[PDB]
Amino acid sequence: LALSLTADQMVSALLDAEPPILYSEYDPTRPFSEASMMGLLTNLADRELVHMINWAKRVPGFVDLTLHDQVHLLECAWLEILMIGLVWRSMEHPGKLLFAPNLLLDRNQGKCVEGMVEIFDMLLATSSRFRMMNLQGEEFVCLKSIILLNSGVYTFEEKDHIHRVLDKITDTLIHLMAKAGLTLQQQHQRLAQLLLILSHIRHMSNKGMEHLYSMKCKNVVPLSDLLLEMLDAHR
């Protein structure tokens, strides 16, 4: 039934599938260390992760796919999705990352953890882009859904079905741009501009995974077995 939804109710179903904004259990009374700040991040991710899984279930077309396929998609996309979520809601806090309402980290606080400043800088850059283009929440929920469906499709047919629903979201994206008053060529330009940011998000995800993997071998902080299943699917 996913291919037969209207743009409007494609948007509607996605806005309504959105995960809650979680909080950090950060204690503003005791200062940072590499290990406490990272512990705070991977704890937060383990929780967002279980919400993500339910959200993905409510992306149209997803449960049409075999469970083996659903896993593979979530395994490839998960950090990418996490990251765009972070960039989205950090959008109007220039120079900072709103990891959680009670955990907004400035570019400097990225230094507590060795190797993290670099990944922070790429995240804030992207957040500086979304704001520049004045991304809208309706476009956002499309990007996010696109990442979920695109990121793992070539490393598997239902590839077609997936591409078919990926075309629907594309259609949805343009509907949203036409309704917003853009000429045709402003539509195809904006569309392209958004889709090209997914390559950078992919880049950040590739980089974030190598860093997550180094914090793991060095045992500087304990990861939940959920996060490690997720990690270890990448190598």
Partner: peptide, 10 residues
């Protein structure tokens, strides 16, 4: 038996 697969079944 990945915990992800079990979270998807539930």
């Amino acid at each position: 038996h990945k915990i992800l697969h079990r979270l998807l079944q539930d």
